[PDB]
């Protein structure tokens, strides 16, 4: 395992994914913190195993351009063109990078592989360079020739190449963009979402790794949408995170703190987008915990410190169960100095808040505001789904699936139709409780006809049950999972004309890949 190849020659949406996917597979160390692949630690990789060679091809051939890609961060540190090797200046000469390609030219550019440098030398920004097959086809040709009196264009070219390989490896969002370039043969400029993903790749890894057990960030990471709207990410469980394919190595979870275990104070949103609230702001012992709209101010009765001891705290007091039986209510109570079992919860990344002593879960048996919460038998219903984080408004976007087609609401039915920007039926609200709702009808949910039946057609129905078939999780897999089922969302027989998205065991790839679009 050393050399992955890609060619432009008759390139398909499939073969670019196969290439990206193959590069992700060797860049993955077996480790998978919080469920997302991370890359190998530098002090762990011997110089011998420190590189992948990426062999790119072209029409105006005849030997390929080979990039040296560092397994540690997916940096393009050098590239070869026959006898000649070209290297990027570096802030800290690594033993490994020099000696990487012996028996070869060795020229070093006066610039680094960073974007600030490359843009500087290129004389334009990332948002001004077209991306796509033609741009890559020209970038490859220009890196083949490697004319040192040009150089402006060498640096431009590396911007094309790094974005279309390394960035795509890291994000399924940008991988999507290039697939759409190949399908429509239409070049594209990098939109502000793609630039923010590339800019915040390091931060996202840091946030995820240094998160508590449960995936809650200590600080949000600020991303962008297409159009320049701010996107705040507060946990691994945020649906946008599902497009984060592979992370930089930062640390290992619990001159270097292996990984901090913070105790963040966050809102907890769930059922119908409502918030876990200490009723009327009162903290007398035994006072109920309820559903209530999310306040976005800083009143203390909606803020919960998720402490390491497993308690969940608002003000000075602890989130507590009144008893260990199906139907018993959850309340505020004093935290004890031995710290009792009725006050310990695991808040799981999937969105369940479970009291370990009773194996019963935080539930909302009733969809309306002021409904008293409730430990219940875990059935992974949406009713029983939750999300830590201060940005509580449902993320609104397109769900792209098979053949880069978009889910579209059609009355009581959903199925994937060709993507088209004005939507509005194609817009989906990704709720805090795991449900997918049509933008223009937020009383209705993306629901299984029968969650017990494999092959059951998924419809749009009333959210009012808050059932098993109304919770969905966007997985690093790229699948949409049903917890409880173990089953995935699926386009029948990879055939969109059947108008049926169904519930099916994990295959095989393509007809079961989904991306909540950023
Ligand atoms: C919890 O939410 C609030 C913001 O709404 C933040 O906490 C506050 O910040 C300061 C102001 O001096 C500090 O004095 C607190 O101690 C204060 N309030 C309390 C008691 O929480 C904080 O940003 C947290 N939010 C995030 C981003 O996780
Ligand atoms: C994420 O979703 C899971 C549903 O399958 C929940 O439970 C965990 O799942 C088990 C098998 O996948 C098991 O390996 C786990 O240990 C179990 N929880 C624990 C800590 O015992 C829960 O939502 C999952 N856990 C995370 C990563 O939050
Ligand atoms: O909630 C508390 C806040 O009011 C203040 O900043 O003191 C510490 C915090 O935990």
Automatic annotation (TrEMBL):
GO biological process, one term: defense response
Keywords: Disulfide bond, Glycoprotein, Hydrolase, Lectin, Plant defense, Protein synthesis inhibitor, Repeat, Signal, Toxin
Ricin B lectin domain location: 263-389, 393-517
Intrachain S-S bonds: 251-259, 275-294, 318-335, 406-419, 445-463
Top-level division of the source organism's lineage: Eukaryota
Family: Belongs to the ribosome-inactivating protein family.
Function: The A chain is responsible for inhibiting protein synthesis through the catalytic inactivation of 60S ribosomal subunits by removing adenine from position 4,324 of 28S rRNA. The B chain binds to cell receptors and probably facilitates the entry into the cell of the A chain; B chains are also responsible for cell agglutination (lectin activity).
SUBUNIT field: Might form dimers or tetramers of disulfide-linked A and B chains.
Name of this protein: Ribosome-inactivating protein
